[PDB]
Write an enzyme that holds these catalytic residues in place. Sequence first.
Site, PDB file in Angstrom:
ATOM      1  N   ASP A 180      -3.111   2.192  -7.224  1.00  0.00           N
ATOM      2  CA  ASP A 180      -4.343   2.846  -6.836  1.00  0.00           C
ATOM      3  C   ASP A 180      -3.880   4.283  -6.570  1.00  0.00           C
ATOM      4  OD1 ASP A 180      -6.428   4.022  -5.361  1.00  0.00           O
ATOM      5  OD2 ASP A 180      -6.920   2.180  -4.318  1.00  0.00           O
TER       6      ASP A 180
ATOM      7  N   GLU B 195       4.554   0.374   8.506  1.00  0.00           N
ATOM      8  CA  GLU B 195       4.449  -0.629   7.462  1.00  0.00           C
ATOM      9  C   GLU B 195       5.846  -0.957   6.946  1.00  0.00           C
ATOM     10  OE1 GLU B 195       2.937   0.382   3.657  1.00  0.00           O
ATOM     11  OE2 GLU B 195       2.005  -1.572   3.338  1.00  0.00           O
TER      12      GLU B 195
ATOM     13  N   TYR C 205       5.640  -9.224   0.710  1.00  0.00           N
ATOM     14  CA  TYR C 205       6.818  -8.354   0.816  1.00  0.00           C
ATOM     15  C   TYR C 205       7.905  -8.702   1.833  1.00  0.00           C
ATOM     16  CZ  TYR C 205       3.363  -5.363  -1.572  1.00  0.00           C
ATOM     17  OH  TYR C 205       2.427  -4.759  -2.377  1.00  0.00           O
TER      18      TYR C 205
ATOM     19  N   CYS D  31       2.097  -5.222  -5.206  1.00  0.00           N
ATOM     20  CA  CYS D  31       1.845  -4.070  -6.080  1.00  0.00           C
ATOM     21  C   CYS D  31       3.192  -3.428  -6.411  1.00  0.00           C
ATOM     22  CB  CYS D  31       0.909  -3.057  -5.409  1.00  0.00           C
ATOM     23  SG  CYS D  31      -0.750  -3.719  -5.011  1.00  0.00           S
TER      24      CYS D  31
ATOM     25  N   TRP E 200      -3.883  -3.337   6.635  1.00  0.00           N
ATOM     26  CA  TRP E 200      -3.886  -4.652   5.990  1.00  0.00           C
ATOM     27  C   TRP E 200      -4.942  -5.647   6.475  1.00  0.00           C
ATOM     28  CZ3 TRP E 200      -1.843  -6.168   1.607  1.00  0.00           C
ATOM     29  CH2 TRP E 200      -0.742  -5.457   1.079  1.00  0.00           C
TER      30      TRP E 200
ATOM     31  N   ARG F 246       3.554  -2.550 -10.486  1.00  0.00           N
ATOM     32  CA  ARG F 246       2.688  -3.158 -11.510  1.00  0.00           C
ATOM     33  C   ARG F 246       1.258  -2.620 -11.544  1.00  0.00           C
ATOM     34  NH1 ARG F 246      -1.426  -6.193  -9.606  1.00  0.00           N
ATOM     35  NH2 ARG F 246      -1.111  -6.996  -7.486  1.00  0.00           N
TER      36      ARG F 246
HETATM   37  C1  LIG Z   1      -0.154   1.447  -0.271  1.00  0.00           C
HETATM   38  C2  LIG Z   1      -0.416   0.822   0.713  1.00  0.00           C
HETATM   39  C3  LIG Z   1      -0.625   0.020   1.897  1.00  0.00           C
HETATM   40  N1  LIG Z   1      -2.026  -0.374   1.990  1.00  0.00           N
HETATM   41  C4  LIG Z   1      -2.315  -1.773   1.620  1.00  0.00           C
HETATM   42  C5  LIG Z   1      -3.105  -1.950   0.373  1.00  0.00           C
HETATM   43  C6  LIG Z   1      -3.763  -3.169   0.196  1.00  0.00           C
HETATM   44  C7  LIG Z   1      -4.783  -3.263  -0.757  1.00  0.00           C
HETATM   45  C8  LIG Z   1      -5.170  -2.177  -1.562  1.00  0.00           C
HETATM   46  N2  LIG Z   1      -6.220  -2.258  -2.422  1.00  0.00           N
HETATM   47  C9  LIG Z   1      -6.682  -1.160  -3.084  1.00  0.00           C
HETATM   48  N3  LIG Z   1      -7.818  -1.173  -3.785  1.00  0.00           N
HETATM   49  N4  LIG Z   1      -5.997  -0.017  -3.021  1.00  0.00           N
HETATM   50  C10 LIG Z   1      -4.887   0.097  -2.241  1.00  0.00           C
HETATM   51  O1  LIG Z   1      -4.153   1.260  -2.295  1.00  0.00           O
HETATM   52  C11 LIG Z   1      -4.481  -0.965  -1.421  1.00  0.00           C
HETATM   53  C12 LIG Z   1      -3.458  -0.856  -0.460  1.00  0.00           C
HETATM   54  C13 LIG Z   1      -2.965   0.524   2.357  1.00  0.00           C
HETATM   55  C14 LIG Z   1      -4.258   0.079   2.729  1.00  0.00           C
HETATM   56  C15 LIG Z   1      -5.253   0.976   3.102  1.00  0.00           C
HETATM   57  C16 LIG Z   1      -4.965   2.340   3.121  1.00  0.00           C
HETATM   58  C17 LIG Z   1      -5.963   3.242   3.643  1.00  0.00           C
HETATM   59  O2  LIG Z   1      -7.160   2.948   3.732  1.00  0.00           O
HETATM   60  N5  LIG Z   1      -5.514   4.432   4.042  1.00  0.00           N
HETATM   61  C18 LIG Z   1      -6.340   5.489   4.631  1.00  0.00           C
HETATM   62  C19 LIG Z   1      -5.902   5.661   6.087  1.00  0.00           C
HETATM   63  C20 LIG Z   1      -6.739   4.879   7.075  1.00  0.00           C
HETATM   64  C21 LIG Z   1      -5.995   4.546   8.354  1.00  0.00           C
HETATM   65  O3  LIG Z   1      -5.439   5.458   9.005  1.00  0.00           O
HETATM   66  O4  LIG Z   1      -5.976   3.353   8.717  1.00  0.00           O
HETATM   67  C22 LIG Z   1      -6.123   6.785   3.855  1.00  0.00           C
HETATM   68  O5  LIG Z   1      -7.043   7.625   3.853  1.00  0.00           O
HETATM   69  O6  LIG Z   1      -5.037   6.943   3.261  1.00  0.00           O
HETATM   70  C23 LIG Z   1      -3.692   2.805   2.735  1.00  0.00           C
HETATM   71  C24 LIG Z   1      -2.695   1.903   2.356  1.00  0.00           C
HETATM   72  C1  LIG Z   2      -1.664  -2.648  -3.805  1.00  0.00           C
HETATM   73  C2  LIG Z   2      -0.829  -2.414  -2.539  1.00  0.00           C
HETATM   74  C3  LIG Z   2       0.122  -1.244  -2.681  1.00  0.00           C
HETATM   75  O1  LIG Z   2       1.205  -1.238  -2.100  1.00  0.00           O
HETATM   76  N1  LIG Z   2      -0.244  -0.196  -3.520  1.00  0.00           N
HETATM   77  C4  LIG Z   2      -1.337  -0.173  -4.362  1.00  0.00           C
HETATM   78  O2  LIG Z   2      -1.648   0.822  -5.031  1.00  0.00           O
HETATM   79  N2  LIG Z   2      -2.084  -1.340  -4.409  1.00  0.00           N
HETATM   80  C5  LIG Z   2      -3.364  -1.351  -5.144  1.00  0.00           C
HETATM   81  C6  LIG Z   2      -3.211  -1.753  -6.612  1.00  0.00           C
HETATM   82  C7  LIG Z   2      -4.606  -2.252  -6.930  1.00  0.00           C
HETATM   83  O3  LIG Z   2      -5.496  -1.135  -6.979  1.00  0.00           O
HETATM   84  C8  LIG Z   2      -5.026  -3.095  -5.726  1.00  0.00           C
HETATM   85  C9  LIG Z   2      -4.430  -4.497  -5.807  1.00  0.00           C
HETATM   86  O4  LIG Z   2      -5.243  -5.085  -6.860  1.00  0.00           O
HETATM   87  P1  LIG Z   2      -4.639  -5.897  -8.010  1.00  0.00           P
HETATM   88  O5  LIG Z   2      -3.845  -7.019  -7.522  1.00  0.00           O
HETATM   89  O6  LIG Z   2      -3.851  -5.014  -8.877  1.00  0.00           O
HETATM   90  O7  LIG Z   2      -5.801  -6.432  -8.790  1.00  0.00           O
HETATM   91  O8  LIG Z   2      -4.326  -2.367  -4.638  1.00  0.00           O
END
Ligand SMILES: C#CCN(Cc1ccc2[nH]c(N)nc(=O)c2c1)c1ccc(C(=O)N[C@@H](CCC(=O)O)C(=O)O)cc1
Ligand SMILES: *c1cc(=O)[nH]c(=O)n1[C@H]1C[C@H](O)[C@@H](COP(=O)(O)O)O1
Lengths: 264, 264
Positions: free
Chosen positions: A169, A58, A94, A146, A80, A166
């Site tokens: 999660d 990433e 980003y 984020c 993603w 900002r």
């Molecule tokens: C931060 C960030 C980037 N991101 C992007 C991103 C986009 C939207 C989001 N939305 C929400 N609700 N929370 C997030 O943390 C979030 C993160 C991520 C997205 C998914 C996972 C995830 O599901 N991770 C699993 C691994 C699954 C896999 O191997 O594919 C885990 O158990 O950690 C982690 C990071």
């Molecule tokens: C967004 C992506 C990242 O890099 N890390 C994160 O924790 N998130 C989380 C924040 C939030 O839970 C959600 C995005 O929702 P919102 O725009 O804040 O409403 O993913």
Amino acid sequence: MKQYLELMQKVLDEGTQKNDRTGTGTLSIFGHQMRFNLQDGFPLVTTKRCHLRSIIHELLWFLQGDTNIAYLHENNVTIWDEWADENGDLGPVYGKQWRAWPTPDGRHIDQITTVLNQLKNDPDSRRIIVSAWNVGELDKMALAPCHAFFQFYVADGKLSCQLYQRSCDVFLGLPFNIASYALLVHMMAQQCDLEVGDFVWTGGDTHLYSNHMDQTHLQLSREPRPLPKLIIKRKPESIFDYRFEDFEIEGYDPHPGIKAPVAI
Amino acid sequence: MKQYLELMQKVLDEGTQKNDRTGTGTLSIFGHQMRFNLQDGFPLVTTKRCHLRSIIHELLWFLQGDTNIAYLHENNVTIWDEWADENGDLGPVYGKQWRAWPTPDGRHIDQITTVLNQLKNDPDSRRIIVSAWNVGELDKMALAPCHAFFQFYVADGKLSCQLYQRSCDVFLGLPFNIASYALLVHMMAQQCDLEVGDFVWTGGDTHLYSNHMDQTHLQLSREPRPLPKLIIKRKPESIFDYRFEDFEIEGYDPHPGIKAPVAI
Ligand SMILES: C#CCN(Cc1ccc2[nH]c(N)nc(=O)c2c1)c1ccc(C(=O)N[C@@H](CCC(=O)O)C(=O)O)cc1
Ligand SMILES: *c1cc(=O)[nH]c(=O)n1[C@H]1C[C@H](O)[C@@H](COP(=O)(O)O)O1
Ligand SMILES: C#CCN(Cc1ccc2[nH]c(N)nc(=O)c2c1)c1ccc(C(=O)N[C@@H](CCC(=O)O)C(=O)O)cc1
Ligand SMILES: *c1cc(=O)[nH]c(=O)n1[C@H]1C[C@H](O)[C@@H](COP(=O)(O)O)O1
């Protein structure tokens, strides 16, 4: 990690039930800061197994200025997928802002290159910043940044970095965000011949989703194991020439992974 | 204030001697966060007398989207004189970015209006942000934004705000920056019919200039007095219609002012 588990506990103890965009519901706090001395070890969560492959790819993806998930799919990273359109695009998120922030007058600014020049020619600058919060392009983004704004600092031959996130999660996103930036600091320090300093994480709306409660309670019962060591085998010509293969995480023996649904 | 005096002491105790743009020299730390419960009182430094007139007029000036010091001079506020050009301009600084962020496609975005709409229609939004860090216009700015990015948060009928200040002059600038934003929160809360929550201040390079040492030692020997109360006499039609006369600070009995030279 100790700092990480304390934050989880803090949210459970002081979090206010709050509704959110996804309609999932969260326990939330506002304003939190923690610091990781990179010299103490690589800040990778050990109380649950984190997918390094996703984290590393990433970051390299961000650095290429890429915003289409194609590269990620080529490498079996699907983190993603839920936000990309039919063509796999996410909009000027980003990568695009980091490498090609569009100016009103038609120019494009490479913030990473600018940062490298500042670190090399003016390490005392209080303006070594990279921002992904492009107000004029937020409407075109699939998801607002984020981790939106970070600043580098140089003192006593060491490189530090503070990230302003900002929205956070705590369960799914934070482990990735911490590791990701700690990595970028090591890379930057290597390119600039500096020692690694501190990674300061500052959050805005820091929360635990209601459907992550069992996962959270499970993880909180585990003891953190010694932090691993990050080994960068090679020193590329530039910050843009690193490869997945150049990284080695030594001594990473985490507890079992914990699955949790992502709030879309 | 207790939080403020602790920060001063922290910098004196843990600050690293560092050179800076002005060539003055500073004791600096990186990454600090403090919180002010606005319900406890108006966070105005009492260990030294602060010029309210300057603080208030600077904020109203920001809100007008003004970047020329003319308005300030009309009101006998000279805090920005050293950086303005022959025509009194400072470039597209704070005011301009807040009220008219120029997009690549020719549009202008009013961030304050957007914020008001978000607070009124979607208080749970984790994207209620205003940013003055316009990468594409930094070169035209007389001085890069110190207080660069802030976010609002709404929980339990209360409005909170977190400011990310990249560079902080602890002695001269911080008292102004804290009071200024605490004021904006009260204004926003009034316009949105919310109670005031917390003001979370987060700094990057937080420092004390070498030529402020005697001033610092003098101030640290003083005891903080009870915080004053902010009284907003009227409720204007909009956030853009406040007047200096609408504000009252009740019970402000500070220690004598302490003069200190500004590093240009
Ligand atoms: C931060 C960030 C980037 N991101 C992007 C991103 C986009 C939207 C989001 N939305 C929400 N609700 N929370 C997030 O943390 C979030 C993160 C991520 C997205 C998914 C996972 C995830 O599901 N991770 C699993 C691994 C699954 C896999 O191997 O594919 C885990 O158990 O950690 C982690 C990071
Ligand atoms: C967004 C992506 C990242 O890099 N890390 C994160 O924790 N998130 C989380 C924040 C939030 O839970 C959600 C995005 O929702 P919102 O725009 O804040 O409403 O993913
Ligand atoms: C923050 C901010 C805005 N600003 C703008 C601003 C611009 C450049 C800066 N540069 C440096 N080195 N430090 C600053 O805090 C700073 C602040 C201020 C500028 C001056 C004063 C100042 O000299 N204050 C005197 C009062 C003198 C008067 O009444 O005119 C004081 O004793 O406090 C305060 C704030
Ligand atoms: C800038 C203006 C403000 O609102 N508050 C501040 O404290 N300052 C300070 C920060 C720094 O000491 C100097 C600006 O210098 P630099 O751009 O950080 O090098 O004024």
